[PDB]
Design an enzyme around this catalytic site. Sequence first.
Site, mmCIF file in Angstrom:
data_model
loop_
_atom_site.group_PDB
_atom_site.id
_atom_site.type_symbol
_atom_site.label_atom_id
_atom_site.label_comp_id
_atom_site.label_asym_id
_atom_site.label_seq_id
_atom_site.Cartn_x
_atom_site.Cartn_y
_atom_site.Cartn_z
ATOM 1 N N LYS A 111 7.780 -6.970 -3.781
ATOM 2 C CA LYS A 111 6.842 -7.028 -2.451
ATOM 3 C C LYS A 111 6.430 -8.320 -2.286
ATOM 4 O O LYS A 111 6.577 -8.926 -1.355
ATOM 5 C CB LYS A 111 5.691 -5.875 -2.458
ATOM 6 C CG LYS A 111 4.442 -6.230 -1.810
ATOM 7 C CD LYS A 111 4.809 -5.800 -0.391
ATOM 8 C CE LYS A 111 3.270 -5.902 0.346
ATOM 9 N NZ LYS A 111 2.540 -7.147 0.473
ATOM 10 N N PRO A 128 9.681 -6.382 3.944
ATOM 11 C CA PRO A 128 8.664 -6.298 2.920
ATOM 12 C C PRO A 128 8.167 -4.939 3.289
ATOM 13 O O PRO A 128 7.462 -4.548 4.019
ATOM 14 C CB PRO A 128 7.481 -7.329 3.123
ATOM 15 C CG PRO A 128 8.539 -8.520 3.771
ATOM 16 C CD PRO A 128 9.162 -7.691 4.767
ATOM 17 N N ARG A 181 -5.728 -9.894 -11.799
ATOM 18 C CA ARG A 181 -4.760 -10.669 -10.978
ATOM 19 C C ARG A 181 -5.138 -12.013 -11.452
ATOM 20 O O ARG A 181 -4.036 -12.898 -11.402
ATOM 21 C CB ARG A 181 -4.984 -10.611 -9.775
ATOM 22 C CG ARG A 181 -4.581 -9.090 -9.206
ATOM 23 C CD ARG A 181 -4.864 -9.082 -7.590
ATOM 24 N NE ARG A 181 -5.260 -7.688 -7.256
ATOM 25 C CZ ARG A 181 -6.283 -6.793 -7.628
ATOM 26 N NH1 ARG A 181 -7.483 -7.369 -8.259
ATOM 27 N NH2 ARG A 181 -6.222 -5.637 -7.274
ATOM 28 N N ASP A 218 5.483 -2.120 2.203
ATOM 29 C CA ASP A 218 3.975 -1.908 1.646
ATOM 30 C C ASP A 218 3.986 -0.333 1.697
ATOM 31 O O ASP A 218 4.900 0.386 2.217
ATOM 32 C CB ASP A 218 2.874 -2.678 2.227
ATOM 33 C CG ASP A 218 3.072 -2.407 3.688
ATOM 34 O OD1 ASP A 218 3.917 -2.323 4.286
ATOM 35 O OD2 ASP A 218 1.727 -2.221 4.103
#
Length: 289
Positions: free
Chosen positions: A221, A238, A179, A240
């Site tokens: 997301k 959202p 990331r 998940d």
Amino acid sequence: MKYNVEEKGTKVIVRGIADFNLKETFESGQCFRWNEEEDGSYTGVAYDRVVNVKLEGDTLIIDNTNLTDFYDIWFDYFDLGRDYGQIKESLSKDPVLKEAIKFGQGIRILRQDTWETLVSFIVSQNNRIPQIKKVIENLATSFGNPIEYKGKIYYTFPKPEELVMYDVETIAKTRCGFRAKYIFDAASKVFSGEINLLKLHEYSTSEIRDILMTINGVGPKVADCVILYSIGRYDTFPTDVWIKRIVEHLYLKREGTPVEIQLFAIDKFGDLSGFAQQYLFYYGREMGK
DNA sequence: AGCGTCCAGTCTACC
DNA sequence: GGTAGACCTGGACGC
Ligand code: NA
């Protein structure tokens, strides 16, 4: 919502609190930098400030703040103007939500800084909560600015301008893994003014989604999390992996993609979808399986 | 035990 | 147009 606000010493006192629980709000999955103290209060770093929030019945005590900061930052941050009682009543017409709500009566949706929310949820992808919190604290310690409260040094969340001079590998020392390049790209695009976070709210939700998703590492997301948790567009849901399985088990009674879970919820809940999502989430974590 | 193995959103390469 | 597989890190899990 009607409050009695008073500045006493180094703190601001708010009376008339309703539909608010610190634990439920801070452990709802929306935020990462609020931590429980021994007295049950929570200390957090947001908007370049460190404050301690304590709730005693209908009385909120915010330590290390003033009247100016309370009205400028914290009122909106804890979304105090909104009537969550009405929200819960409207949602409780669904039996599934009514049950979920009894375990999370005090969940409020925080209105967090756009940049911090963006990076925080970039960090969150394919990651567990304990690890997300450690990486975010590492980013603040490594790259942020020192501020002090009761003899202890806390660190602000690093701005794009406080990240751009570092290479990916330096960023990667925060333990964020693959990331790092996503944080790198986000910092670069905001710093250059290519993505303007202050003017983002002027756009439609679809437009915001598209702007944010230009960043490497930001998909649907992460974009929706920024939109809900920072922009305050509550007609969003959202999705998940948890909320997918939660909606599947409790509503659909069959498997589905994150996308079909999403449009079902927005259809059923409308402008209160974001609130519904929070209740379902804390309920799912309460039940486990 | 002390090791192997599974895995908790987005990109890439490839249909 | 769409998606299988990889992916840092690191706890949980089986034997
Ligand atoms: Na992207």
